[PDB]
Amino acid sequence: MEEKLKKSKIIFVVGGPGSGKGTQCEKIVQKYGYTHLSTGDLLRAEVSSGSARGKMLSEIMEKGQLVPLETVLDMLRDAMVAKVDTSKGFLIDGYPREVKQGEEFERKIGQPTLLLYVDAGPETMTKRLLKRGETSGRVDDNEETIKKRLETYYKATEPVIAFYEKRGIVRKVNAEGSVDDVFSQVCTHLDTLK
């Protein structure tokens, strides 16, 4: 299972909050048939579970503490193994988030074959974020999250990108345009896969 994983096709999809990285991922899975994994999607399902894991998390969260990187990575390992005999590839949404977190993933799971960098400029993600707030009921008064979420991304995230191009695996998509025209670009990179 060490090797079966290491040879698996792993694509990190990294980009700012509101860059449109989920929708892209959902078109990849429809096209390509890859396995699409979001951390907050695992987190959510863990919680619902009622696992002993699902509960340590719930409770550290409700204290409003930050979830620990090894449990997140554990969670992710399990889910990749569980699909490894059957899957075409793994699609990993918003991850890493911190350079050392991309370090932990290669050690404990496997190397990424590709890093999909969904690049959108600031007003594009902010907008997309304003609209997504209405869409969910989020009463928010403040641009303290938009503003702050963005800031933290450029701060922690944009340095994953630099770590990555050293290895020659990053491929950037301009994320302005339709979902179809951004996806058009994704196809390009996805095509040279394997």
Side-chain angles (χ1 to χ4, degrees), residues 107-153:
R107 212 265 276 75
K108 131 129 71 144
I109 291 170
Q111 216 104 129
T113 300
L114 214 230
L115 178 333
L116 218 323
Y117 181 9
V118 189
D119 187 51
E123 198 219 330
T124 317
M125 345 185 118
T126 271
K127 235 112 233 258
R128 165 168 30 241
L129 282 187
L130 285 182
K131 130 191 154 271
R132 203 130 88 186
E134 293 183 88
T135 265
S136 225
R138 311 217 241 251
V139 332
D140 276 329
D141 268 73
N142 284 208
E143 198 124 317
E144 99 101 43
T145 24
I146 307 267
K147 212 257 176 232
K148 238 198 183 54
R149 263 161 116 210
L150 276 166
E151 218 163 286
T152 283
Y153 159 67

Side-chain angles (χ1 to χ4, degrees), residues 1-138:
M1 194 80 275
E2 328 237 82
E3 309 304 282
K4 211 165 289 151
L5 294 162
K6 283 194 176 304
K7 98 172 194 109
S8 253
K9 128 141 53 143
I10 321 148
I11 311 164
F12 292 151
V13 185
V14 335
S19 66
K21 125 186 124 264
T23 101
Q24 273 332 106
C25 269
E26 267 190 17
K27 306 188 127 277
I28 297 183
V29 354
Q30 258 283 91
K31 216 253 188 177
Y32 303 81
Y34 275 43
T35 306
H36 166 232
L37 277 16
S38 342
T39 68
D41 223 350
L42 264 26
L43 254 174
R44 142 182 283 61
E46 198 69 40
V47 206
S48 310
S49 243
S51 24
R53 196 155 64 190
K55 284 156 342 199
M56 120 188 177
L57 303 166
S58 206
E59 113 168 25
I60 100 201
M61 269 179 215
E62 319 183 317
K63 270 171 179 92
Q65 272 154 197
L66 146 159
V67 151
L69 171 135
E70 97 127 356
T71 294
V72 153
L73 277 191
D74 261 2
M75 288 192 263
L76 221 12
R77 208 176 160 289
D78 285 354
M80 309 145 62
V81 156
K83 307 263 176 268
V84 85
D85 298 323
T86 11
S87 219
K88 309 299 231 199
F90 290 99
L91 216 65
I92 298 150
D93 249 45
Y95 193 111
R97 268 186 54 182
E98 272 155 348
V99 165
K100 197 213 60 191
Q101 152 170 149
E103 269 171 314
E104 276 299 307
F105 176 139
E106 285 156 63
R107 212 265 276 75
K108 131 129 71 144
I109 291 170
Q111 216 104 129
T113 300
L114 214 230
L115 178 333
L116 218 323
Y117 181 9
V118 189
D119 187 51
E123 198 219 330
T124 317
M125 345 185 118
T126 271
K127 235 112 233 258
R128 165 168 30 241
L129 282 187
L130 285 182
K131 130 191 154 271
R132 203 130 88 186
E134 293 183 88
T135 265
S136 225
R138 311 217 241 251

